[PDB]
């Protein structure tokens, strides 16, 4: 199935690598919630940027 | 004092003083020892102040071992000299201590004679040392 | 008494790693005297520069007595 994510930190003082992990998921700004198809590659990007995110189910 | 006879090089980097001491922390020869519980570096004149303190509070017998040996030369530019013309000359020699390392060992004495003898040698060293036994 | 004077850093290395595809003149390893020996389909030029002769995939295998490093190119 799917899983919804929530961007809860900013993107501005971050690395060049975590700032592309979040853009690869499709998050644009804070409190923007998308649906990803939960594959081994989408939830690989979540493990890098776990602290910017809120995986609420 | 204590220093090498001939050295393959003349000067050396600074480096760092990291980690604990896993080898060097076990008493091997004596039955009592003075191990060091704070990191620092000893400058090879402190060793002869601490050695000549233990050897006159015994007066009778005992055997003394000195576990640590300074081999690291340390430089110092002379006064009234601007910076950046080379590297200064070697003034003295340094050993590098890290917590757990055993400094002195003693055997053939009483424990309460020796406990109040390492009190004298600890007041000459810039480290916080402790008293340990042989197991 | 005074000592600056370094040299200018020849750019040695190992190109063309474990699964690459090659041609016939590729170089695969500069070298400094036989870290890697001439395997199956490679050249070993003048100053011990390896090079390819046929086409395929690099291997980097350890073989034989003396345990020497053989760079061979496999037609795969």
């Amino acid at each position: 199935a799917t899983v919804k994510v929530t961007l809860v930190k900013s993107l501005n003082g971050r690395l060049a690598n975590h700032k592309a992990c979040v853009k690869g998921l499709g998050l644009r700004r804070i409190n923007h919630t998308v649906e990803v198809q939960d594959t081994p590659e989408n939830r690989g990007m979540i493990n890098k940027a776990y602290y910017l995110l809120r995986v609420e189910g | 004092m204590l220093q090498p006879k001939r050295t393959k090089f003349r000067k050396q980097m600074t480096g760092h003083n990291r980690g604990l001491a896993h080898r060097g922390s076990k008493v091997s020869f004596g039955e009592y020892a003075l191990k060091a519980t704070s990191r620092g570096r000893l400058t090879a004149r402190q060793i002869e102040s601490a050695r000549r303190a233990l050897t006159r509070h015994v007066k009778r017998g005992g055997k003394i071992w000195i576990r640590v040996f300074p081999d690291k030369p340390v430089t110092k530019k002379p006064l009234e000299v601007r910076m950046g013309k080379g590297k200064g000359g070697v003034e003295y020699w340094v050993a590098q201590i890290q917590p757990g390392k055993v400094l002195y060992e003693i055997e053939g004495v009483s424990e309460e004679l020796a406990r109040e003898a390492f009190a004298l040698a600890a007041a000459k060293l810039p480290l916080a040392t402790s008293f340990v036994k042989r197991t | 008494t005074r000592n600056g004077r370094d040299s200018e850093s020849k750019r040695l290395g190992v190109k063309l790693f474990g699964g690459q595809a090659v041609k016939a003149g590729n170089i695969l390893v500069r070298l400094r005297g036989t870290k890697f020996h001439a395997g199956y389909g490679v050249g070993l030029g003048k100053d011990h520069t390896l090079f390819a002769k046929v086409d395929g995939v690099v291997k980097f295998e350890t073989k034989g007595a003396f345990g020497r490093k053989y760079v061979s190119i496999v037609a795969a």
Binding site: - | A21, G61, P99, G100, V132 | -
Partner: protein
């Protein structure tokens, strides 16, 4: 000599350090001849009584893992170098027939009156201790008595001189060597 243990189904660096500050436990393993190695938690308040004991290193200890009972001999102690306290224990199952290897304390029992000490101005310098053993687990050597009361100012004592009782070998004579044990010499 008795301890009692638990199972410890949490392995790592993180879970192993939380044992020591939260609960006060000490990790351990039990590995032996017949079975698999099994990990174990013990307390730091208990092992403290056994490590304070004298001959407890070269002696058999009964371990209560669950209600599981096993005769266990201890051959390792990893110990914290800075402060000084016990870290994981690493001991051994005891089979009724597989040889064994441990270390044994010495005592130097009679050195009050030695001919090197009373006649000439004497000193006795114990070089070695903790000599090993190679025995059969049925009959244990707790210690070995050495007597340097006897002959000389100016003789060293080898490993060949002192005797291992009831048919126990010494590994250092099994290798081609014979270490010196104790000296008698003049003081400075």
């Amino acid at each position: 000599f008795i301890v009692n243990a638990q199972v410890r189904s949490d392995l790592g660096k993180g879970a192993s350090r939380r044992l020591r500050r939260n609960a006060g436990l000490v990790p351990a393993v039990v590995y032996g001849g017949d079975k698999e190695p099994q990990s174990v938690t013990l307390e730091l308040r208990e092992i403290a009584k056994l490590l304070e004991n004298e001959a407890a290193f070269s002696h058999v200890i009964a371990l209560n893992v669950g209600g599981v009972k096993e005769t266990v001999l201890i051959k390792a102690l990893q110990r914290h170098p800075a402060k000084g306290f016990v870290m994981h224990a690493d001991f051994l199952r005891v089979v009724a027939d597989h040889k064994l290897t441990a270390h044994v304390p010495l005592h130097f029992i009679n050195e009050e009156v030695a001919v090197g000490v009373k006649q000439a101005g004497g000193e006795i310098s114990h070089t070695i201790s903790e000599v090993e053993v190679s025995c059969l687990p049925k009959d244990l050597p707790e210690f070995i008595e050495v007597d340097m009361a006897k002959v000389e100012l100016g003789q060293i004592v080898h490993l060949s001189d002192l005797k291992a009782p009831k048919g126990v070998e010494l590994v250092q004579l099994a290798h081609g060597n014979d270490l010196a044990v104790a000296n008698i010499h003049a003081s400075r």
